[PDB]
Design an enzyme around this catalytic site. Structure first.
Site, PDB file in Angstrom:
ATOM      1  N   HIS A  84       0.814  -1.241   0.000  1.00 36.02           N
ATOM      2  CA  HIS A  84       0.000   0.000   0.000  1.00 36.02           C
ATOM      3  C   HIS A  84       0.863   1.315   0.000  1.00 36.02           C
ATOM      4  O   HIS A  84       0.691   2.196   0.826  1.00 36.02           O
ATOM      5  CB  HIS A  84      -1.103   0.034   1.088  1.00 36.02           C
ATOM      6  CG  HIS A  84      -2.121  -1.032   0.985  1.00 36.02           C
ATOM      7  ND1 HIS A  84      -2.022  -2.224   1.643  1.00 36.02           N
ATOM      8  CD2 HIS A  84      -3.283  -1.106   0.265  1.00 36.02           C
ATOM      9  CE1 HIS A  84      -3.130  -2.949   1.448  1.00 36.02           C
ATOM     10  NE2 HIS A  84      -3.889  -2.318   0.564  1.00 36.02           N
ATOM     11  N   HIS A  88       1.057   1.543  -5.831  1.00 37.31           N
ATOM     12  CA  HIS A  88      -0.292   0.983  -5.805  1.00 37.31           C
ATOM     13  C   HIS A  88      -1.293   2.021  -6.240  1.00 37.31           C
ATOM     14  O   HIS A  88      -2.230   1.726  -7.011  1.00 37.31           O
ATOM     15  CB  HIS A  88      -0.641   0.351  -4.534  1.00 37.31           C
ATOM     16  CG  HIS A  88      -2.097  -0.006  -4.391  1.00 37.31           C
ATOM     17  ND1 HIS A  88      -2.705  -1.010  -5.117  1.00 37.31           N
ATOM     18  CD2 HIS A  88      -3.049   0.513  -3.578  1.00 37.31           C
ATOM     19  CE1 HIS A  88      -3.969  -1.070  -4.738  1.00 37.31           C
ATOM     20  NE2 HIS A  88      -4.165  -0.237  -3.721  1.00 37.31           N
ATOM     21  N   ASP A 125      -5.429   5.576  -0.911  1.00 38.94           N
ATOM     22  CA  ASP A 125      -4.788   4.891   0.205  1.00 38.94           C
ATOM     23  C   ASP A 125      -3.696   5.810   0.859  1.00 38.94           C
ATOM     24  O   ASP A 125      -2.801   5.373   1.525  1.00 38.94           O
ATOM     25  CB  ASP A 125      -4.211   3.651  -0.314  1.00 38.94           C
ATOM     26  CG  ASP A 125      -5.093   2.411  -0.197  1.00 38.94           C
ATOM     27  OD1 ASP A 125      -5.987   2.178   0.686  1.00 38.94           O
ATOM     28  OD2 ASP A 125      -4.790   1.531  -1.023  1.00 38.94           O
ATOM     29  N   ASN A 245      -5.506  -6.437  -9.399  1.00 41.29           N
ATOM     30  CA  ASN A 245      -4.237  -7.182  -9.588  1.00 41.29           C
ATOM     31  C   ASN A 245      -4.455  -8.575 -10.191  1.00 41.29           C
ATOM     32  O   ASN A 245      -3.728  -8.992 -11.055  1.00 41.29           O
ATOM     33  CB  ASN A 245      -3.433  -7.360  -8.278  1.00 41.29           C
ATOM     34  CG  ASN A 245      -3.007  -6.042  -7.571  1.00 41.29           C
ATOM     35  OD1 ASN A 245      -2.954  -6.082  -6.366  1.00 41.29           O
ATOM     36  ND2 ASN A 245      -2.821  -4.904  -8.281  1.00 41.29           N
ATOM     37  N   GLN A 293      -5.211 -17.307  -3.197  1.00 38.60           N
ATOM     38  CA  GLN A 293      -5.506 -16.597  -4.430  1.00 38.60           C
ATOM     39  C   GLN A 293      -6.594 -17.199  -5.191  1.00 38.60           C
ATOM     40  O   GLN A 293      -7.451 -16.473  -5.731  1.00 38.60           O
ATOM     41  CB  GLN A 293      -4.254 -16.495  -5.320  1.00 38.60           C
ATOM     42  CG  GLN A 293      -3.133 -15.519  -4.853  1.00 38.60           C
ATOM     43  CD  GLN A 293      -3.665 -14.244  -4.279  1.00 38.60           C
ATOM     44  OE1 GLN A 293      -4.385 -13.457  -4.981  1.00 38.60           O
ATOM     45  NE2 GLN A 293      -3.446 -14.054  -2.938  1.00 38.60           N
ATOM     46  N   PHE A 296      -9.768 -16.311  -3.287  1.00 41.57           N
ATOM     47  CA  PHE A 296     -10.105 -14.899  -3.446  1.00 41.57           C
ATOM     48  C   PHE A 296     -10.640 -14.591  -4.871  1.00 41.57           C
ATOM     49  O   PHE A 296     -11.493 -13.714  -5.043  1.00 41.57           O
ATOM     50  CB  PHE A 296      -8.830 -14.084  -3.207  1.00 41.57           C
ATOM     51  CG  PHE A 296      -9.022 -12.605  -3.241  1.00 41.57           C
ATOM     52  CD1 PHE A 296      -9.769 -11.977  -2.273  1.00 41.57           C
ATOM     53  CD2 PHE A 296      -8.436 -11.854  -4.190  1.00 41.57           C
ATOM     54  CE1 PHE A 296      -9.928 -10.621  -2.229  1.00 41.57           C
ATOM     55  CE2 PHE A 296      -8.564 -10.467  -4.141  1.00 41.57           C
ATOM     56  CZ  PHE A 296      -9.392  -9.876  -3.200  1.00 41.57           C
TER      57      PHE A 296
HETATM   58 MG   LIG Z   1      -7.883   0.994   0.701  1.00 42.88          MG
HETATM   59 ZN   LIG Z   2      -5.945   0.386  -2.512  1.00 48.15          ZN
END
Ligand SMILES: [Mg+2]
Ligand SMILES: [Zn+2]
Length: 334
Positions: A84, A88, A125, A245, A293, A296
């Site tokens: 983060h 990103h 973020d 991603n 993964q 998810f």
């Molecule tokens: Mg966030």
């Molecule tokens: Zn983010």
């Protein structure tokens, strides 16, 4: 007296070349843009997208001011946070810029709505400390007490991006009218709040609603004059971008994942050390990267992208394909 990319770099012609061919592509190499621009992916990608969409001209944003604001935003991302950080943010910003290009979305959004979603993306973020909302709640951290457990980090990221606008000669929005600044502020808020994961289920339910309303319409396209509908799309769009991603080219997906897992493991290490139960995927003693993964992708990412691809059918096909190939690749490396 402004460098060709906003901030100066050692690698100007290479970067021009990359930006000229790659920025309207799915699947851009944000790590190389970062290395080529000396840590300035965010500032450079953002500068170039805003130039390319004529957003400086349209909103009378002084380019020295834009550049300085972004340099400060970029500095308040934490480089030592593995996932983060500002790379990103550059990723999400570019991805959102890509998802706006789908033919099924031509002329649906106002320019101020475009401005909002892209500004939101860049800041969504800012100041992340490398721990989840659940961790901050579970630990009674100051931020969780302050925000009463609700969208803790998202609220904080918004706070930090707005304080930075204050600072001397950093208010990129200075030349906008009063009723616009307040409209924009309202959208940006709603957009960065839509990146909180706990809203996933709700947004995806509204997005399928709107898919179903497009399949049954007489003219196979949607009445999107209601601002309330438009903002739902844009909420889903910035969240898709944040969960993009696993639908990026395999090599980029894996790099993003190695970073995310290092962030998560560090958080589990802090949990272990405080006698707390270890968050899902955060346990280095117990976790199984590939299986996580696939699960998810099956339970969160695929059904979101499927519905997004269905809304913009057929302009996002490559996304869903790359997502599925990546799923299968991770399944047979188990
Ligand atoms: Mg966030
Ligand atoms: Zn983010």
């Amino acid at each position: 007296f402004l460098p060709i990319h906003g901030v100066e770099t050692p690698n100007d012609n290479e970067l021009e070349e990359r930006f000229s061919l790659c920025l309207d592509e799915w699947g851009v190499d944000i790590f190389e843009i970062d290395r080529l621009s000396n840590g300035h992916a965010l500032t450079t990608v953002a500068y170039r997208i805003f130039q390319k969409r004529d957003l400086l001209k349209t909103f009378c944003i002084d380019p020295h001011v834009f550049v300085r604001y972004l340099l400060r935003v970029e500095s308040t991302y934490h480089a030592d946070v593995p996932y983060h950080n500002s790379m990103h943010a550059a990723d999400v910003l570019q991805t959102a810029h890509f998802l706006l290009q789908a033919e099924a979305l031509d002329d649906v959004f106002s320019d101020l709505e475009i401005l909002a979603v892209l500004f939101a993306a860049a800041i969504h973020d800012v100041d992340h400390p490398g721990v989840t909302n659940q961790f901050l709640i579970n630990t009674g951290h100051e931020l969780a007490l302050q925000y009463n457990d609700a969208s803790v980090l998202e609220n904080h990221h918004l706070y930090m991006a707005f304080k930075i606008l204050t600072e001397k000669d950093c208010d990129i929005f200075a030349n906008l009218g009063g009723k616009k600044r307040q409209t924009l502020r309202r959208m940006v808020i709603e957009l960065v709040l839509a990146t909180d994961m706990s809203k996933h289920m709700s947004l995806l339910a509204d997005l399928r609603t709107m898919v179903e309303t497009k399949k049954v319409s007489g003219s196979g396209m949607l009445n999107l004059d209601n601002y309330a509908d438009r903002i739902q799309i844009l909420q889903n769009m910035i969240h898709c971008a944040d969960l993009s991603n696993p639908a990026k080219p395999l090599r980029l997906y894996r790099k993003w994942t190695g970073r995310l897992i290092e962030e998560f493991f560090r958080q589990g290490d802090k949990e272990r050390e405080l006698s707390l139960e270890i968050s899902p995927m955060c346990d280095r003693e117990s976790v199984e990267v590939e299986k996580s993964q696939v699960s998810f992708i099956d339970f969160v990412c695929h059904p979101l992208w499927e519905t997004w691809c269905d809304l913009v059918h057929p302009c996002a096909q490559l996304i869903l394909d790359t997502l599925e190939d990546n799923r299968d690749w991770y399944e047979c490396h188990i």
